C-alpha cells in the first residue's frame, strides 16, 4: 500500500502536528522518494520506514523532534547530508541492509552533533579492514555502533 494512504492510516484521524511515533514499515514508497511527511509533524521524534523501497532521502522535511530514524533494507546509497539540515537532533540512526559502501558516504553524518547510536548491518561499509575503528575516528560523537560498545 502507497505511503501517502499508509501515513493517512496510521494517522487515525490525528493532525499530524501532535503525533509523536510513526511507522510505515512495508508500505511503498514513491518511486523510491518518501510520500506524505510534511514539517507538519513537529512532535514526531520516532520515524520508522522500514522496506519502503526507499532509493532517497533527499526530500525529507523539517523534523525539528525526530531523535529515532528507522530506515532498514531499504537501497538508500547517500545524499546523507540531508540529515544534519532536517533533522538535527537525532541520536539513533538505523541504515542496516541499505546501499552504504564506503566511508565518504557516511562522513556527512558528523554534522550529526547528538548522534550516539548508528546501525550499518549488512552494509557493504561493514566489510572494511578497521571497519570500526574507522567509523568511530569518523564520527567521535558516536557511543554506539551495531549495537556495540
Same mark, same amino acid.
Given at each position: 500500500?502507497?505511503?501517502?494512504?499508509?501515513?493517512?492510516?496510521?494517522?487515525?484521524?490525528?493532525?499530524?502536528?501532535?503525533?509523536?511515533?510513526? %511507522?510505515?514499515?512495508?508500505?511503498?514508497?514513491?518511486?523510491?522518494?518518501?510520500?506524505?511527511? $510534511?514539517?507538519?509533524?513537529?512532535?514526531?521524534?520516532?520515524?520508522? $520506514?522500514?522496506?519502503?523501497?526507499?532509493?532517497?532521502?533527499?526530500?525529507?522535511?523539517?523534523?525539528?523532534?525526530?531523535?529515532?530514524?528507522?530506515?532498514?533494507?531499504?537501497? %538508500?546509497?547517500?545524499?546523507?547530508? %540531508?540529515?544534519?539540515?532536517?533533522?538535527?537532533?537525532? $541520536?539513533?540512526?538505523?541504515?542496516?541492509?541499505?546501499?552504504?559502501?564506503?566511508?565518504?558516504?557516511?562522513?556527512?553524518?558528523?554534522?550529526?552533533?547528538?548522534?550516539?547510536?548508528?546501525?550499518?548491518?549488512?552494509?557493504? %561499509? $561493514?566489510?572494511?579492514?578497521?571497519?570500526?575503528?574507522?567509523?568511530?575516528?569518523?564520527?567521535?560523537?558516536?557511543?554506539?555502533?551495531?549495537?556495540?560498545?
Amino acid at each position: 500500500m502507497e505511503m501517502g494512504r499508509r501515513i493517512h492510516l496510521e494517522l487515525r484521524n490525528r493532525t499530524p502536528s501532535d503525533v509523536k511515533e510513526l %511507522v510505515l514499515d512495508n508500505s511503498r514508497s514513491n518511486e523510491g522518494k518518501l510520500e506524505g511527511l $510534511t514539517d507538519e509533524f513537529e512532535e514526531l521524534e520516532f520515524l520508522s $520506514t522500514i522496506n519502503v523501497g526507499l532509493t532517497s532521502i533527499a526530500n525529507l522535511p523539517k523534523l525539528n523532534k525526530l531523535k529515532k530514524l528507522e530506515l532498514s533494507d531499504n537501497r %538508500v546509497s547517500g545524499g546523507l547530508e %540531508v540529515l544534519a539540515e532536517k533533522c538535527p537532533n537525532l $541520536t539513533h540512526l538505523n541504515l542496516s541492509g541499505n546501499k552504504i559502501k564506503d566511508l565518504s558516504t557516511i562522513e556527512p553524518l558528523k554534522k550529526l552533533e547528538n548522534l550516539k547510536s548508528l546501525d550499518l548491518f549488512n552494509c557493504e %561499509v $561493514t566489510n572494511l579492514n578497521d571497519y570500526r575503528e574507522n567509523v568511530f575516528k569518523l564520527l567521535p560523537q558516536l557511543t554506539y555502533l551495531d549495537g556495540y560498545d
